[PDB]
């Protein structure tokens, strides 16, 4: 199971991983982890072809055979043609060395190159629920958008470190306490205690409320399938938050911040997009992709759902499933 590019003149080195031959990034060539065996092949545009097998000092007495065998399977995709040489570390071939300018760098133990230290960095999901219930208390997740508030109801805004029980002007005092009670839980249990709560009266919204929702406009009183949902990813707040900016389909374009990444969830019927603003940073990029994951994962979306990344300016005619034709 070789690439089939093995014919192209030049050099090919594969570190025999386990059973599979892995081609060494052109930079990494010249350095051989000594616990593995490698295969290196050099062939001139008219010259012969020598396929040497490099065996590390700490390379298994067997890992060797495995590799030699693989040499064979390859001798054959070229058929008996390549020349075979057994190169042992510490006594390579005056020819083997010919493939390497500066010299060899035998490594040992330690960790694979490009080895990174993945740091699970939690994210704060800012959520807004619209409480409702005379007897029975049920807070429903709404989108964190003023288009969500009404004046005769209470709402809870879980902004992580701080929670708010904003209270409709035309809502009850009873309705108000239910809100505070529920939200008081949210800090007590889910926050395990560390997080501030503050009851808010319509009108008197604190900075933070406006810092997330924006400029408060007028609100409605209250009486009258497209799963698409718009979320935003920004660490602007010195911390990475995920916020569900909208959940009805004709999305208001204003919604989109040139400074953050967004994720347009539509996996239900297809793809999940990730829009990147010019000024959005990479943690935002890194993270918007990772949230696209959690979206297919948690909602158990079709396996083959595609996550098409769209840069600002260069948005796809489909993505424009926002109100006035974008």
Contact residues for Eu ion, defined by CB under 5 A:
35-36, 63, 234, 236, 259-260
Minimum CB separation of residue 302 from Eu ion in Å reads 31
Minimum CB separation of residue 16 from Eu ion in Å reads 8
**In this complex, which beta carbon is closest to Eu ion, that of residue 16 or of residue 131?**
16
Distance, in Å, from the CA atom of 11 to the CA atom of 49, rounded to the nearest integer, reads 10
User: Angle at Cα 177 formed by Cα 173 and Cα 181, nearest 5°?
Assistant: 175
**In this complex, which beta carbon is closest to Eu ion, that of residue 122 or of residue 282?**
282
Distance, in Å, from the CA atom of 185 to the CA atom of 129, rounded to the nearest integer, reads 14
**In this complex, which beta carbon is closest to Eu ion, that of residue 113 or of residue 226?**
113
Tell me which residue has tokens 């052109």. Answer: 26
DSSP summary character for residue 289:
H
Give the SS3 label for residue 114: coil
**In this complex, which beta carbon is closest to Eu ion, that of residue 140 or of residue 258?**
258
Give the SS3 label for residue 121: coil
**Alpha carbon of 86 to those of 21, 73, 83: distances in Å?**
17, 16, 10
Contacts of 197 (CB under 8 A, 6+ apart): 162, 163, 164, 165, 180, 183, 184, 186, 187
Distance, in Å, from the CA atom of 70 to the CA atom of 63, rounded to the nearest integer, reads 11
Distance, in Å, from the CA atom of 64 to the CA atom of 45, rounded to the nearest integer, reads 29
**In this complex, which beta carbon is closest to Eu ion, that of residue 29 or of residue 281?**
281
Minimum CB separation of residue 21 from Eu ion in Å reads 14
Minimum CB separation of residue 113 from Eu ion in Å reads 16
In contact, 245 and 231? CB cutoff 8 Å: yes
**In this complex, which beta carbon is closest to Eu ion, that of residue 179 or of residue 291?**
291
**In this complex, which beta carbon is closest to Eu ion, that of residue 132 or of residue 285?**
285
Minimum CB separation of residue 35 from Eu ion in Å reads 4
Among 24, 181, 157, 42, which residue's Cα sits nearest to residue 99? 42
Other beta carbons within 10 Å of 242:
19
**In this complex, which beta carbon is closest to Eu ion, that of residue 236 or of residue 309?**
236
Minimum CB separation of residue 309 from Eu ion in Å reads 17
Q: What sign does the CA torsion over 208, 212, 216, 222 have?
A: negative
Minimum CB separation of residue 115 from Eu ion in Å reads 17
- 40, β-bridge pairs: 13, 52
Minimum CB separation of residue 141 from Eu ion in Å reads 24
Give the SS3 label for residue 63: helix
**In this complex, which beta carbon is closest to Eu ion, that of residue 158 or of residue 260?**
260
Q: What sign does the CA torsion over 104, 105, 111, 114 have?
A: negative
Minimum CB separation of residue 109 from Eu ion in Å reads 11
């Amino acid at each position: 199971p070789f690439p089939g590019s093995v014919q192209d003149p030049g050099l090919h080195v594969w570190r025999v991983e386990k059973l599979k031959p892995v081609p060494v990034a052109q930079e990494n060539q010249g350095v051989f982890f000594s616990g593995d065996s490698y295969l290196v092949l050099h062939n001139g545009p008219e010259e012969v072809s020598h396929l040497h097998l490099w065996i590390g000092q700490q390379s298994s007495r067997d890992e060797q055979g495995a590799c030699a065998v693989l040499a064979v399977q390859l001798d054959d995709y070229l058929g008996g043609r390549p020349v075979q040489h057994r190169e042992v570390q510490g006594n390579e071939s005056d020819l083997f060395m010919s493939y390497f300018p500066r010299g060899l760098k035998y490594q040992e133990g330690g960790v694979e190159s490009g080895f990174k230290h993945v740091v699970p960095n939690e994210v704060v999901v800012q959520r807004l629920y619209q409480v409702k219930g005379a007897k029975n208390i049920r807070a429903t997740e709404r989108a964190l958008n003023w288009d969500s508030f009404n004046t005769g109801d209470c709402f809870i805004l879980d902004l992580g470190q701080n929670i708010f029980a904003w209270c409709g002007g035309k809502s009850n005092i009873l309705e108000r306490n239910k809100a505070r009670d529920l939200a008081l839980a949210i800090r007590d249990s889910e926050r395990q205690g560390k997080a501030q709560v503050e009851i808010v009266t319509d009108g008197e919204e604190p900075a933070e409320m406006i810092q997330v929702l924006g400029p408060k406009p007028a609100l409605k009183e209250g009486n009258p399938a497209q799963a698409a949902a718009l979320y935003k990813v920004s660490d602007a707040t010195g911390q990475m938050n995920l916020t569900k900016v909208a959940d009805s389909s004709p999305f208001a374009l204003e919604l989109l911040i040139s400074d953050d990444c967004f994720v347009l969830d539509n996996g239900l019927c297809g793809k999940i997009y990730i829009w990147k603003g010019r000024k959005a940073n990479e943690k935002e990029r890194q993270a918007a992709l990772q949230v696209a994951e959690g979206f297919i994962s948690r909602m158990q979306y079709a396996p083959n759902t595609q996550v098409e990344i769209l840069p600002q300016g260069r948005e796809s005619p489909i993505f424009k499933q926002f109100f006035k034709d974008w």
